[PDB]
Amino acid sequence: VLSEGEWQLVLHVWAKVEADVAGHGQDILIRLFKSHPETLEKFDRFKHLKTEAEMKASEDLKKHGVTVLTALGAILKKKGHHEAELKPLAQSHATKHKIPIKYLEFISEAIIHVLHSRHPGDFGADAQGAMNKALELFRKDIAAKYKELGYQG
Numbered sequence: 033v034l035s036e037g038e039w040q041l042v043l044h045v046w047a048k049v050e051a052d053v054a055g056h057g058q059d060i061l062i063r064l065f066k067s068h069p070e071t072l073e074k075f076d077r078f079k080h081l082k083t084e085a086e087m088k089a090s091e092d093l094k095k096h097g098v099t100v101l102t103a104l105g106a107i108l109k110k111k112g113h114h115e116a117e118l119k120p121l122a123q124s125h126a127t128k129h130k131i132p133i134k135y136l137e138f139i140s141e142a143i144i145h146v147l148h149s150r151h152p153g154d155f156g157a158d159a160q161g162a163m164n165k166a167l168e169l170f171r172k173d174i175a176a177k178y179k180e181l182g183y184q185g
């Protein structure tokens with residue numbers, strides 16, 4: 033359970049992300065695909081992309097980054113009271129997209145890295161630890177839904 037002070041750190045940096053949702057979404061998905069190429073393979077939509085320059089030039093990838101970060105921002109702003117938001121996301125990611133919980137750990141690392149690069153003044157160690165806790169809570173709750181459905185592993 034995050035404290036109020038931890039949530040304030042999380043949402044303070046997140047409010048900075050929302051000034052350029054699309055640029056953050058590109059940076060995060062590109063970092064994910066470069067650092068963990070198995071993740072790119074899960075996207076029929078993107079797996080034709082073979083270089084970082086091609087990834088950066090894809091408008092469709094930029095659009096999907098906005099989709100992803102809009103969903104995550106709506107979860108973070110619930111401060112843990114996010115059951116309604118996680119139900120459809122766990123269902124699609126477990127049963128349709130077939131995304132292991134481990135790949136959610138990978139995108140969480142990519143999110144933290146990009147926030148540290150773009151917002152160092154608002155993403156000191158206290159805020160890094162709080163965002164790590166928020167993304168851990170996300171993964172914990174998604175993992176419980178995966179386990180219900182028979183996909184935790």
Ligand code: HEM
Pocket residue numbers: 071072074075076077099100101103104120121124125129131135136139
């Ligand atoms: C912060 C974590 C993530 C969030 C908030 C998120 C959010 C979303 C949303 C909102 C959609 C569209 C609606 C839906 O299908 O449920 C989507 C689609 C999808 N996501 Fe995620 N996602 C996350 C992580 C991942 C990861 C790590 C992968 C793969 C490694 C992944 C793979 C996919 C795929 C394959 C689609 C369908 C893309 C398409 O063909 O249109 N997601 N995601």
